[PDB]
Amino acid sequence: DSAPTSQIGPTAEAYIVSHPDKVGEVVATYLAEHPEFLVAASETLHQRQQIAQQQAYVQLALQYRAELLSSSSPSVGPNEAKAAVVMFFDYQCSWCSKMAPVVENLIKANPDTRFIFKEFPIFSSRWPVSGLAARVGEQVWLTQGGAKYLDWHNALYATGKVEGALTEHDVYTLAQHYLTPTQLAAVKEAQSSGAVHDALLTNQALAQHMDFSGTPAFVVMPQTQDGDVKRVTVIPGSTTQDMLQMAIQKAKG
């Protein structure tokens, strides 16, 4: 029937709000039959969860800046570089391995930027091999420097041994060419002691705090403590040179 025009609209929708089943069912049925709405809602959902995830990772990077930029981690590039690229990787991660040539290109193309190496184990069974590889790398880094650590790092990848195929025997076999016999013997005795190399414990604790457990990733950020969320980028271990380069420029700007 009929009623005051100014009251119909507001009253009709307030009634549906109070008693939603009848209009909820009829519209839901309409939507089940024109389900194209699902395709657009799902796109909006994932587009917004991506942004929300990134924002939350950026907050974590700002909170753990000191740990991320620790001078205890092997790095190349200047210690006071304006931008840092922090890399969480497992030597037995097969796509981290395939990313190594891209990272090497980034490093050559950005001699002014600090690249920090966070070795960690994706799975529990990798702890003996990851820990051993971190022991060797730390010895190489501490006695011969960052560029030489990077040779060792690339050489370990170049075995092509990934996803369980890299053994302690393999690491030792390569490591005899980078360590003195005395260093090598000291690494073997530490590994056999049951102790877990401190960098592996620290890196895994940091990965868990960063919500990177089991997941390789890059953090690109200015080193000087600035709360500018706009200069930080958190990127999956699988990425491109262009994407990492843009993050570097954003971290320098």
| Span 96-155, contacts to a second copy by CB under 8 A | 98-101, 104-105, 108, 122-127, 135, 138-139, 142-145, 147, 151, 155
By the rule CB under 8 A, 240 interacts with a second copy: yes
Which of the residues 194 through 223 are near a second copy (CB under 8 A)? 195-199, 201-202, 204-205, 208, 211-217
Least distance (Å) between residue 216 CB and a second copy:
7
Instruction: Select the residue interacting with a second copy from 22, 111, 112, 227 (CB under 8 A).
Output: 22
Instruction: Name the H helices within 110-240.
Output: 127-144, 146-158, 168-175, 181-192, 198-209
The span of 4-12, 43-51, 106-114, 187-195 binding Mg ion (CB under 5 A) equals: 106-114
**CA 229 remoteness from chain centre:** 17
Least distance (Å) between residue 142 CB and a second copy:
5
Cα–Cα separations (whole angstroms), residue 194 to 153, 169, 187, 247: 24, 16, 12, 40
Over the window 36 to 55, marking each residue x when it contacts a second copy by CB under 8 A and - when it does not, the resulting string is: xxxxxxxxxxxxxxxxxxx-
Nearest to 148 by CA among 88, 74, 93: 74
By the rule CB under 8 A, 229 interacts with a second copy: no
Which of the residues 108 through 167 are near Mg ion (CB under 5 A)? 110, 112-113
| Contact (CB, 8 A) for 72 and 115 | no
Least distance (Å) between residue 79 CB and a second copy:
6
Token pair 């994407």 in the structure block, residue: 243
By the rule CB under 8 A, 177 interacts with a second copy: yes
By the rule CB under 8 A, 225 interacts with a second copy: no
Within 10 A of 158 (CB to CB), how many other CB atoms are there? 11
By the rule CB under 8 A, 245 interacts with a second copy: no
Strand order in the sheet with 83-89: 75-76, 114-119, 83-89, 217-222, 233-236
Nearest to 207 by CA among 195, 196, 219: 219
Q: Which does 113 bind (CB under 5 to 8 A by kind): Mg ion, a second copy, none?
A: Mg ion
By the rule CB under 8 A, 184 interacts with a second copy: no
Cα–Cα separations (whole angstroms), residue 13 to 16, 18, 21, 146, 160: 5, 9, 13, 68, 65
By the rule CB under 8 A, 181 interacts with a second copy: no
